[PDB]
Structure 1
Amino acid sequence: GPVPSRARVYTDVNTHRPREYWDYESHVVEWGNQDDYQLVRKLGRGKYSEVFEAINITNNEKVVVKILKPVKKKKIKREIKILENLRGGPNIITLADIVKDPVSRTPALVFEHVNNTDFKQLYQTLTDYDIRFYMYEILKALDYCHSMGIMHRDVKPHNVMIDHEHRKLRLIDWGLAEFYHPGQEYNVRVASRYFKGPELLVDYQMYDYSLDMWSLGCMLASMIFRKEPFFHGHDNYDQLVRIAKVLGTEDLYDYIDKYNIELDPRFNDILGRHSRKRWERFVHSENQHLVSPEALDFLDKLLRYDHQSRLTAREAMEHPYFYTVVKD
């Protein structure tokens, strides 16, 4: 069978916690007053929720209300508990309240207001300096949640809300987040296609926080090379082929051989043989101002097949790429 794997950091954080911290299924939700909130405008709808601009009429402040679609009671308490555990953390969206919507008959999460502008709307027009700046802000959120025993599992531009005027960033949509427990096998049907790590694409279930670091790498590659998305697969199989055309097939086989994983035989007719490409191949006159030796080294250390070999969030924050960013 497959060889087991463990996170190399924050491995045992949940094993030492009281049950109450990670046992989300036992969580007793504390309900506020739906009457406090007036819905203003529908901002978005996904498979799991509809999101609204609203106002809290008890203090006149703007808020965002996310009305959860019926999904699985388990997933609802999981998101709630994760949001409560992470509250006040660096660049983590703040859950202000939880109420029952009278029409949907489901929970509605109330978040402190953020500007209705996601990172996807900005990240292709940032300066070199600002790419570094906002990458560091995203890393603060990731190292915090990882240190708290939680992996986000859906890191992507749409899940980073940015207020560029105020140089402010929040990581949102914790509906796919999970608690990391060593030796646990997780669902590989997480993350969005272009941001899925190789572990997901080869069906390796014993993954960890390092999944998020692959996703972050994909974002970085897209920004510095001005290529959206960087790995542009037409489905989940072709997604792995697109990765292999950059990182090469020999290191892919080394990865799957390390963990004693077998590829879906469906790959035999599509994967081929590909050399590792040098990162300089993606540099051109229109993106070169965004590329530096430090950027390429950093990217190279995020986009590794072997999840155990990727930089952790904290190691990433130590990287020379961030030396030019002013620290508070």
Structure 2
Amino acid sequence: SKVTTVVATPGQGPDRPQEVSYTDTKVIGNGSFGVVYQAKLCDSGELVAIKKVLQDKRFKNRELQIMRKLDHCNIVRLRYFFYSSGEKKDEVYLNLVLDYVPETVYRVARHYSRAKQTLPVIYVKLYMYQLFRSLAYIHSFGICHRDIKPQNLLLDPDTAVLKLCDFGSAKQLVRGEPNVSYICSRYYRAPELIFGATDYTSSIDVWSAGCVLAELLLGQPIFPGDSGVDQLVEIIKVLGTPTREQIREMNPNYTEFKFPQIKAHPWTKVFRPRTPPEAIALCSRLLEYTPTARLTPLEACAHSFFDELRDPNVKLPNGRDTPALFNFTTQELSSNPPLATILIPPHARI
């Protein structure tokens, strides 16, 4: 019954701090940057995640700046933020108070692989669709996540709601500005990243999404490797050897450097039999060498693989209705507004 009370600034709206009291503080996670706690708001009894990172008081926190602009049902909500000091004197910590979300795609996928089963396709559809909406939204602001991986896909198992989280690697990509190639986790890195390109687009997130789709179908990572070399060999084993043109599209400086000559492995034979053709088709349009050839997130949402989600009789296996799938805004559809006639089916929102 130990209560902590802070004066915390709401994430959205005007910069108007209020007194916030919370209790039942326990460490849900540790990342390189800092610790994540669970806590219960005293007023509502609602559970929150508090992400605590060391802050260079001088400069502004990019993660905070980005999350204050984000309002989407498939992105974890910033409820408050506040500053605290401890450990070393003169060390200030930024605290992000987020909606608590009990599971991850990582943990749920790990359960099914440990028990020798695959995630039922209905969840692959729900989870990937919600990921592609969250990407469609941030990409419409020029914001690239740059760390799309199962650990950063939060899940409410009861409602089947997915929330994208962890904007610590996130950055507004501006044409002609170079960006670091050393972002994004091992198995989910786009080939242009592995080739050390600094002129990459938001399409790195689509490749990462494709790696998550493939992984949920296979029950293991599709492009594993301890080195970039090992990863590229695993990519080449599936896509075949990239053409000199395809290489120019990824990183032009790496044309003269050479790798084994291999023909593309048929996508249908990459996955087990009775993996739905539409799932396989979508993968092939996400995991493309040429960044500009990859589907956009919004195009991905409109893919036939997600048609079951647009069926008026679709239900969760636990009997509940699907979560919000169709509450698109103008911002979200801006990349291609005509897709609205596919994305919003006749039965939705009337």
Class of the TM-score when normalised by the shorter of the 2 chains: 0.7 to 0.9
**In structure 1, which of residues 105, 108, 112 is the aligned counterpart of residue 99 of structure 2?**
112
Three-state SS of the structure 2 residue aligned to 1:36 is strand
Query: Contact 1:34–1:101 at 8 Å: present in 2 too?
Result: no
Q: What is the letter of the counterpart of residue 145 of structure 1? A: I
Find 1:263's aligned residue among 225, 239, 254. Answer: 254
Does 2:126 align with 1:133? yes
SS at match of 1:187: coil
CA contact (8 A) 2:238 2:270 kept: no
Check if 1:300 corresponds to 2:288: no
Look up the equivalent residue of 1:204 and give its one-letter code.
A
Match of 2:187 among 188, 191, 194: 194
Query: Do the aligned partners of residues 308 and 264 (structure 1) sit closer, same or farther apart at CA in structure 2, a change above 3 Å counting?
Result: closer
Aligned residues: 288
Question: 1:32, CA displacement in angstroms?
Answer: 4.8
Deviation at 1:308, TM superposition (A): 0.8
Matched residues in 2 for 1:263 and 1:292: separation?
36
Displacement of 1:292 in angstroms is 1.6
Q: Could you tell me which residue of structure 2 aligns to residue 18 of structure 1?
A: none
CA contact (8 A) 1:249 1:275 kept: yes
- The CA RMSD measured in Å over matched residues stands at 2.4
Specify the alignment match of 1:154 in structure 2.
Answer: 147
Shift of 1:258: 4.3
1:177-256 aligned at under 5 Å gives the runs: 177-226=170-219, 228-251=220-243, 253-256=244-247
**CA shift digits 1:211-234 (9 cap, x unpaired):** 1000000001111122x2110111
TM-score, scaled relative to structure 2: 0.76
Q: Which amino acid counterpart does residue 108 of structure 1 have in structure 2?
A: N
Q: Secondary structure at the match of 1:324?
A: helix
CA contact (8 A) 2:21 2:41 kept: yes
The percentage of counterpart residues that share the same residue type is 31
Q: Residues 248 and 255 of structure 2 are in contact (CA less than 8 Å); yes or no, is this contact kept in structure 1?
A: no
Q: CA deviation at 1:235?
A: 1.8
Aligned with 1:92: secondary structure? coil
User: Offset at 1:73?
Assistant: 6.4
Q: Could you tell me how far apart the structure 2 residues matched to 1:73 and 1:223 are?
A: 43
Could you tell me how far apart the structure 2 residues matched to 1:221 and 1:34 are?
45
Task: State whether residues 154 and 165 of structure 2, in contact with CA within 8 Å, keep that contact through their aligned partners in structure 1.
Answer: yes
What amino acid is aligned across from residue 153 of structure 1 in structure 2? Answer: R
Note closer, same or farther for the CA distance 1:72–1:298 as it changes in structure 2 (3 Å cut): farther
Gaps in structure 2 of 5+ consecutive residues: 1-13, 113-117, 311-324, 326-347
Secondary structure of 2:308's counterpart equals coil
Q: What is the CA–CA distance in structure 2 between the aligned matches of 1:197 and 1:178, rounded to whole Å? A: 16
Query: Which runs of 5 or more structure 1 residues have no equivalent in the other structure?
Result: 1-28
Matching residue's letter, 1:122: V
Q: Are 1:63 and 2:33 counterparts?
A: no
Question: What letter is aligned with 1:306?
Answer: T
The one-character-per-residue Cα deviations of 1:242-290 (angstroms, maximum 9, x if unpaired) are 2112111133x3322346623398x65xx32221111122233xxx34x
Moved over 4 A (4+): 29-35, 70-74
- 1:164 matched to which residue of 2? 157
Give the 3 Å change call, closer, same or farther, for CA 256–72 of structure 1 in structure 2.
Answer: farther
Contact 1:221–1:299 (8 Å) recurs in 2: yes
Distance 1:122 1:187, change over 3 A: same
- Quick one: distance in 2 between partners of 1:257 and 1:114? 41
Matches within 5 A, 1:288-327: 288-289=273-274, 291-326=275-310
Taking a change above 3 Å as real, the CA distance of residues 188 and 31 of structure 1, as seen in their structure-2 partners, is: farther
Please name the residue that 1:91 is paired with.
74
Distance change in 2, residues 1:164/1:292 (3 Å): same
The equivalences for 1:29-108 within 5 A come to 32=17, 36-38=21-23, 40-69=25-54, 74=59, 77-86=61-70, 88-103=71-86, 105-108=92-95
User: Which AA in structure 1 matches 2:80?
Assistant: D
Distance 1:237 1:177 in 2: 26
Distance 1:73 1:188, change over 3 A: farther
Relative to structure 1, the CA distance from residue 40 to residue 276 in structure 2 (aligned partners, 3 Å threshold; closer, same or farther) is same
Compare 205-214 and 231-240 and name the one that shifted more. Answer: 231-240
Which TM-score applies when normalising by structure 1?
Answer: 0.81
Any idea what SS the aligned residue of 1:214 has? helix
Residue from 251, 254, 263 that aligns with 1:275: 263
Which residue identity does 2:172 align to in structure 1?
A: F
Which has the higher mean CA deviation after the structures are superposed, 55-64 or 39-48? Answer: 55-64
